[PDB]
Ligand binder design. Sequence first.
Ligand SMILES: COc1nnc2ccc(N3CCC(c4ccc(OCCN5CCN(C)C(=O)[C@H]5C)cc4)CC3)nn12
Lengths: 126, 126
Amino acid sequence: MNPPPPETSNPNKPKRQTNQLQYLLRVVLKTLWKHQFAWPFQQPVDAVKLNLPDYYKIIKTPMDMGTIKKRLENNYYWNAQECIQDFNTMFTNCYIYNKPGDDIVLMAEALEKLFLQKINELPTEE
Amino acid sequence: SMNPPPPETSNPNKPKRQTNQLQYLLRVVLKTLWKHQFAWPFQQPVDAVKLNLPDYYKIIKTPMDMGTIKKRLENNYYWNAQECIQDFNTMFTNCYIYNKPGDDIVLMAEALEKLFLQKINELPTE
Ligand SMILES: COc1nnc2ccc(N3CCC(c4ccc(OCCN5CCN(C)C(=O)[C@H]5C)cc4)CC3)nn12
């Protein structure tokens, strides 16, 4: 079976609105979401619908852009690095599960290149 | 390389008619396939530029996709149900030709084709 999706809102966690977190939602997540290769990464991997019975035997830290969008909206992250780690986990999971050079891996590699271009333009803390 | 222009979906010089088979192809066949979990790569012409497939249109000279078939049905472009069925078959076979047995995209096309064949076996009598 599929696991429940990652936690996205926690009222017990402290919250802060910052220019780096705003950039991650308004620029980074927005740009990646609209990319031509984003669709398979917009929601948690549905291992049942996709016939991947070993997906959650191999990937114990699933991550997807729909979860990242919700985390940003709900002030789940205190630091930009926590959000950046979730984007990195999403790409790494794809590289671990799939064979190198597969179409899905080339999609993730292109999204990662675009992500890293946008993270180089992360504004300095105000 | 550029993409070719998409297949024509409307031609005001062609005659038009409504048939129970053409209605069934839009209402039942195309609608059922469109909602399938693996339909999304087949819902628009193959954009070889955005998808980074430089040899696609060197191999596939009769491109076809469900977005085009849907528009053809909505524009009364088809006179015979056979023309619509041929377009679905062209779409699947193009996928089998460009890709290789066992590729994820081919398994997606095979699942759609199985459903298509089930729905076409119940095509109403003219
Ligand atoms: C008619 O289209 C058409 N004709 N020739 C072609 C040639 C390639 C091609 N495409 C490019 C590849 C794409 C695609 C491939 C696999 C895939 O998922 C595999 C399962 N995933 C699920 C999601 N995550 C994040 C994963 O790590 C693993 C577990 C998803 C999309 C479908 C479109 N389309 N194409």
